[PDB]
Amino acid sequence: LHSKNVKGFLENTLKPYDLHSVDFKTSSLQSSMIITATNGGILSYATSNSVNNLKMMSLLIKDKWSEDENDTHSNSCYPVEIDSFKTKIYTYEMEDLHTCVAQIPNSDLLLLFIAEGSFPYGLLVIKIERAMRELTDLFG
Amino acid sequence: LHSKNVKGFLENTLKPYDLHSVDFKTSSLQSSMIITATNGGILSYATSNSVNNLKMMSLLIKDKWSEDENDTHSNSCYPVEIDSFKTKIYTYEMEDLHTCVAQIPNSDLLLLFIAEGSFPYGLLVIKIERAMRELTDLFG
Amino acid sequence: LHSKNVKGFLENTLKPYDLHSVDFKTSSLQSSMIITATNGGILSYATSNSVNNLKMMSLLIKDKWSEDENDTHSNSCYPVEIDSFKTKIYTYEMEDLHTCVAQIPNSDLLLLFIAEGSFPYGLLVIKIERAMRELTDLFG
Amino acid sequence: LHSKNVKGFLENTLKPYDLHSVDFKTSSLQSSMIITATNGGILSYATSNSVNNLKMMSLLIKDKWSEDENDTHSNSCYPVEIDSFKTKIYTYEMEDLHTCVAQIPNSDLLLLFIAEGSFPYGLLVIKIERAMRELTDLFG
């Protein structure tokens, strides 16, 4: 009872559960949108399940965007250069969701992802990065 | 603008982010306790960071325990047999935490884990299972 | 150059990358089979993408099964009780794949899962457990 | 036996195991090094467990580096801009390990991470990115 063992046991029990060489998929996004950097004119978009609610965000986010590309960033900004042009990537939680805004040099539009608060921001910034590259690749 | 491509692009973008052969550790538990099935007399315990708060749970959980081993389970119960004796494992969220209670045949006590609501119940039930085996192994 | 800082920096850099409250799906199984415990007569099965190769396993695994339920287990065995009857769950890597065999009390058959070596055994044992319950539930 | 149910059952069983709002840590790096872009003169470094083997890589990687910053990249390159200067981030598996090389504008050195092949490249590129920022922040 409480023996050195029974104590050091419960402690050895606090240890994490290690998963080795596991394959994991994050969930998929909810929205993938393109809005004019200008007023947030939703050009195109895609979902998983109204269009009202979406627009609410296309504008809301864009707001939060120019509010950081001007009013200000050092921590949550992720600057990159694609096809010899530059763009900034921003994350932002809006109503418990993770979102991403980055600009396109070619058309001055904003690319945008919206996802659960269960979608890892890191993978999100990375995901949007390749998205821009692949995007500008198909348009030069 | 909105070209078959620009639409089917944003859609191909909704896709998950796949992690391949990744190594992941869950967090470690907060508490690993043994309480008399009887009144919840905390026999031994271990933590990661008062003893008051703990007891609150040792009793609270035990309550929720006998309240299911009698008042009733089919979904959240995970019956097992260790060292030729039987025990039931139960999960239960109490104040946004994941917990586990299973009984020891040898001493009639309850083994108990408490963790964040970020600790996968599956790994938790599995974790406590081996815990019982390893436990009863050192005491026969 | 090498300043206390530049060293203690690279060290503070060794740290893990923490994902907080993430949603992750494992991959889905490859095969979900039922074989007569007897000779491994594949009764039913399901896949994701020949039937030859499958049978190779239905028998191969079953072999490894009775070779453990008799020839012998303490670490990789996960005994459980479903609908008042008992069954044992076993894991086993065969050609870099994770598999699971457990028996059905009602028909003496073996339930079986086969998956990548990227599918967490823990979740697998847990997955097959509920499978048995849900299985025997629909047949009494 | 094989009933619509017993088949559609095994199929409903192929489904992934969903982890909801889980907290996961990747493993921690093995090496965090700074080498002169020049010849790979290991300036500073840190580990987790000879110094020989390390150097083998400091040079090996640097080789693979300039071999891509010149000989050539579009997929595995991740250009960024830190503190108004530009740098490129590269990933590269060398002997089943994931590594990262990016250059420092201020000293022309290469920052470098080495990790298991179980460490998600995505998180790695992201991890090194902040590393550069935080690095150049402490030196201006």
Side-chain angles (χ1 to χ4, degrees), chain D residues 34-48 50-51:
Chain D
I34 289 182
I35 74 168
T36 58
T38 310
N39 291 345
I42 303 180
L43 185 60
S44 189
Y45 68 77
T47 49
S48 319
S50 42
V51 180

mmCIF file of all heavy atoms in Angstrom, chain D residues 34-51, unseen atoms left out:
data_model
loop_
_atom_site.group_PDB
_atom_site.id
_atom_site.type_symbol
_atom_site.label_atom_id
_atom_site.label_comp_id
_atom_site.label_asym_id
_atom_site.label_seq_id
_atom_site.Cartn_x
_atom_site.Cartn_y
_atom_site.Cartn_z
ATOM 1 N N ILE D 34 24.505 25.659 -37.085
ATOM 2 C CA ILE D 34 24.817 26.835 -37.883
ATOM 3 C C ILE D 34 26.180 26.559 -38.535
ATOM 4 O O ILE D 34 27.169 26.300 -37.852
ATOM 5 C CB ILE D 34 24.881 28.128 -37.023
ATOM 6 C CG1 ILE D 34 23.465 28.520 -36.577
ATOM 7 C CG2 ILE D 34 25.534 29.254 -37.827
ATOM 8 C CD1 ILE D 34 23.371 29.801 -35.763
ATOM 9 N N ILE D 35 26.216 26.567 -39.860
ATOM 10 C CA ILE D 35 27.460 26.323 -40.571
ATOM 11 C C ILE D 35 27.701 27.425 -41.592
ATOM 12 O O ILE D 35 26.764 27.945 -42.202
ATOM 13 C CB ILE D 35 27.442 24.971 -41.314
ATOM 14 C CG1 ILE D 35 26.557 25.062 -42.552
ATOM 15 C CG2 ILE D 35 26.936 23.878 -40.394
ATOM 16 C CD1 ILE D 35 26.708 23.895 -43.470
ATOM 17 N N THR D 36 28.960 27.793 -41.774
ATOM 18 C CA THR D 36 29.282 28.822 -42.742
ATOM 19 C C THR D 36 28.778 28.318 -44.081
ATOM 20 O O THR D 36 29.045 27.174 -44.466
ATOM 21 C CB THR D 36 30.799 29.068 -42.814
ATOM 22 O OG1 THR D 36 31.471 27.846 -43.158
ATOM 23 C CG2 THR D 36 31.316 29.575 -41.473
ATOM 24 N N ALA D 37 28.018 29.152 -44.780
ATOM 25 C CA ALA D 37 27.498 28.735 -46.071
ATOM 26 C C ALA D 37 28.683 28.282 -46.912
ATOM 27 O O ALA D 37 28.585 27.348 -47.712
ATOM 28 C CB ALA D 37 26.790 29.892 -46.748
ATOM 29 N N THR D 38 29.801 28.970 -46.689
ATOM 30 C CA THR D 38 31.081 28.762 -47.370
ATOM 31 C C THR D 38 31.674 27.377 -47.591
ATOM 32 O O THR D 38 31.789 26.908 -48.727
ATOM 33 C CB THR D 38 32.227 29.469 -46.594
ATOM 34 O OG1 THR D 38 31.860 30.831 -46.311
ATOM 35 C CG2 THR D 38 33.525 29.443 -47.410
ATOM 36 N N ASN D 39 32.001 26.710 -46.492
ATOM 37 C CA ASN D 39 32.557 25.361 -46.524
ATOM 38 C C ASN D 39 31.787 24.481 -45.554
ATOM 39 O O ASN D 39 31.989 23.267 -45.502
ATOM 40 C CB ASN D 39 34.044 25.300 -46.166
ATOM 41 C CG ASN D 39 34.925 25.926 -47.230
ATOM 42 O OD1 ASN D 39 34.485 26.158 -48.360
ATOM 43 N ND2 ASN D 39 36.183 26.190 -46.878
ATOM 44 N N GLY D 40 30.898 25.097 -44.786
ATOM 45 C CA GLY D 40 30.127 24.331 -43.836
ATOM 46 C C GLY D 40 30.864 24.264 -42.519
ATOM 47 O O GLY D 40 30.811 23.252 -41.821
ATOM 48 N N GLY D 41 31.560 25.346 -42.186
ATOM 49 C CA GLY D 41 32.283 25.395 -40.932
ATOM 50 C C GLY D 41 31.309 25.464 -39.773
ATOM 51 O O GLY D 41 30.813 26.533 -39.430
ATOM 52 N N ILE D 42 31.024 24.321 -39.168
ATOM 53 C CA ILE D 42 30.096 24.284 -38.048
ATOM 54 C C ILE D 42 30.453 25.319 -36.988
ATOM 55 O O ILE D 42 31.401 25.144 -36.241
ATOM 56 C CB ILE D 42 30.084 22.899 -37.389
ATOM 57 C CG1 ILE D 42 29.717 21.842 -38.433
ATOM 58 C CG2 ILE D 42 29.109 22.889 -36.211
ATOM 59 C CD1 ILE D 42 29.683 20.428 -37.886
ATOM 60 N N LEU D 43 29.686 26.396 -36.919
ATOM 61 C CA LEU D 43 29.958 27.433 -35.933
ATOM 62 C C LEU D 43 29.467 27.019 -34.553
ATOM 63 O O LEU D 43 30.222 27.047 -33.577
ATOM 64 C CB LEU D 43 29.288 28.745 -36.340
ATOM 65 C CG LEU D 43 29.596 29.945 -35.441
ATOM 66 C CD1 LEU D 43 31.096 30.213 -35.440
ATOM 67 C CD2 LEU D 43 28.840 31.169 -35.939
ATOM 68 N N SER D 44 28.190 26.648 -34.482
ATOM 69 C CA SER D 44 27.570 26.221 -33.235
ATOM 70 C C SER D 44 26.620 25.089 -33.532
ATOM 71 O O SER D 44 26.261 24.864 -34.686
ATOM 72 C CB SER D 44 26.793 27.365 -32.585
ATOM 73 O OG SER D 44 26.383 26.997 -31.278
ATOM 74 N N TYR D 45 26.205 24.386 -32.486
ATOM 75 C CA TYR D 45 25.296 23.263 -32.656
ATOM 76 C C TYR D 45 24.749 22.750 -31.325
ATOM 77 O O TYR D 45 25.263 23.093 -30.259
ATOM 78 C CB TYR D 45 26.031 22.136 -33.373
ATOM 79 C CG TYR D 45 27.122 21.516 -32.528
ATOM 80 C CD1 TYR D 45 26.810 20.625 -31.502
ATOM 81 C CD2 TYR D 45 28.466 21.819 -32.751
ATOM 82 C CE1 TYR D 45 27.800 20.054 -30.721
ATOM 83 C CE2 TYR D 45 29.472 21.248 -31.970
ATOM 84 C CZ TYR D 45 29.127 20.362 -30.959
ATOM 85 O OH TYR D 45 30.094 19.756 -30.190
ATOM 86 N N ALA D 46 23.717 21.916 -31.398
ATOM 87 C CA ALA D 46 23.101 21.333 -30.209
ATOM 88 C C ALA D 46 22.502 19.964 -30.550
ATOM 89 O O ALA D 46 22.051 19.751 -31.678
ATOM 90 C CB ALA D 46 22.022 22.264 -29.670
ATOM 91 N N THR D 47 22.500 19.039 -29.589
ATOM 92 C CA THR D 47 21.955 17.698 -29.822
ATOM 93 C C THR D 47 21.038 17.164 -28.723
ATOM 94 O O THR D 47 20.570 17.911 -27.869
ATOM 95 C CB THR D 47 23.075 16.671 -30.054
ATOM 96 O OG1 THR D 47 24.068 16.808 -29.032
ATOM 97 C CG2 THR D 47 23.708 16.876 -31.413
ATOM 98 N N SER D 48 20.802 15.856 -28.742
ATOM 99 C CA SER D 48 19.910 15.235 -27.770
ATOM 100 C C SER D 48 20.422 13.951 -27.104
ATOM 101 O O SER D 48 19.744 13.392 -26.237
ATOM 102 C CB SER D 48 18.575 14.965 -28.453
ATOM 103 O OG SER D 48 18.232 16.061 -29.283
ATOM 104 N N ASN D 49 21.612 13.489 -27.494
ATOM 105 C CA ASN D 49 22.179 12.268 -26.914
ATOM 106 C C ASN D 49 23.660 12.382 -26.495
ATOM 107 O O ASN D 49 24.532 12.800 -27.269
ATOM 108 C CB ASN D 49 21.990 11.093 -27.887
ATOM 109 N N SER D 50 29.521 10.505 -33.756
ATOM 110 C CA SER D 50 29.968 11.519 -32.806
ATOM 111 C C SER D 50 29.884 12.903 -33.440
ATOM 112 O O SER D 50 29.111 13.114 -34.382
ATOM 113 C CB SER D 50 31.409 11.218 -32.348
ATOM 114 O OG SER D 50 32.235 10.803 -33.424
ATOM 115 N N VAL D 51 30.656 13.850 -32.912
ATOM 116 C CA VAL D 51 30.675 15.201 -33.467
ATOM 117 C C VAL D 51 31.161 15.015 -34.911
ATOM 118 O O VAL D 51 30.984 15.881 -35.773
ATOM 119 C CB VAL D 51 31.650 16.124 -32.677
ATOM 120 C CG1 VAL D 51 31.648 17.526 -33.276
ATOM 121 C CG2 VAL D 51 31.242 16.179 -31.203
#
